[PDB]
Amino acid sequence: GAMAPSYRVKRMDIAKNDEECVVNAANPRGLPGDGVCKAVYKKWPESFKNSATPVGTAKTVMCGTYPVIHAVGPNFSNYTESEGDRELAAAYREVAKEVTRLGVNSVAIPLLSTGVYSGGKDRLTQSLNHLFTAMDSTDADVVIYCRDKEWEKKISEAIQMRT
């Protein structure tokens, strides 16, 4: 574990992370996709060998020795608010199991279901609170990656509210 497990947020491309493993905002089919998924495919294409996995699950594939945890959040265009909420919480619980099994001291994570899978809603608080529910019992340093300036501020405030 990290000596004093922490949460941090950075506004930059998760493909440039400084952590021991990365979480992909994957699609269920292991396709290159859009947004964060396409950035992950450009940096770690080898990790998309047999990465297909269902909604609400995570599947780890190595790129060399570097673990890529493909986490499949629900697309709120297709799911009801109720069933999507359940599957989004489930994907983060599976990320926490994978981070624990790998023995890493740090992980780079994007907010699942906040981009092309948001169904055109602002899901920062919903997605971040399910991230915390899963990751709070882990001892990895967690570094959340975002791209919007206002979201960086809101994520940073939310981390500070609990310290």
Binding residues for Cl ion (CB under 5 A): 12-13, 115, 117, 146-148, 151
Q: In what order do the strands lie in the sheet with 66-71?
A: 7-11, 141-146, 106-110, 22-25, 66-71, 58-63
Tell me: is residue 73 an annotated ligand-binding position.
no
Tell me: is residue 117 an annotated ligand-binding position.
yes
Task: State which residue has the least CB distance to Cl ion.
Answer: 115
Tell me: is residue 24 an annotated ligand-binding position.
no
Cβ-based burial of 12 (10 A; exposed 0-12, middle 13-18, buried ≥19) = exposed
Tell me: is residue 55 an annotated ligand-binding position.
no
| Closer Cβ to Cl ion, 9 or 61, answer by number | 9
| Closer Cβ to Cl ion, 13 or 85, answer by number | 13
How far apart, in whole angstroms, are the C-alpha atoms of residue 87 and residue 129? 14
| Closer Cβ to Cl ion, 16 or 101, answer by number | 16
Q: Is the dihedral of CA 116, 119, 124, 130 positive or negative?
A: negative
| Closer Cβ to Cl ion, 38 or 49, answer by number | 38
Tell me: is residue 56 an annotated ligand-binding position.
no
**Which conformational region is residue 84 in: left (phi greater than 0), alpha (psi within -120 to 50 degrees), or beta?**
alpha
How far apart, in whole angstroms, are the C-alpha atoms of residue 126 and residue 24? 18
Q: CB of residue 114 vs Cl ion: minimum separation in angstroms? A: 6
Q: CB of residue 11 vs Cl ion: minimum separation in angstroms? A: 8
Q: CB of residue 4 vs Cl ion: minimum separation in angstroms? A: 27
For the annotated binding site, the residues are: 13, 27, 35, 115-117
For the annotated binding site for ADP-D-ribose, the residues are: 13, 27, 35, 115-117
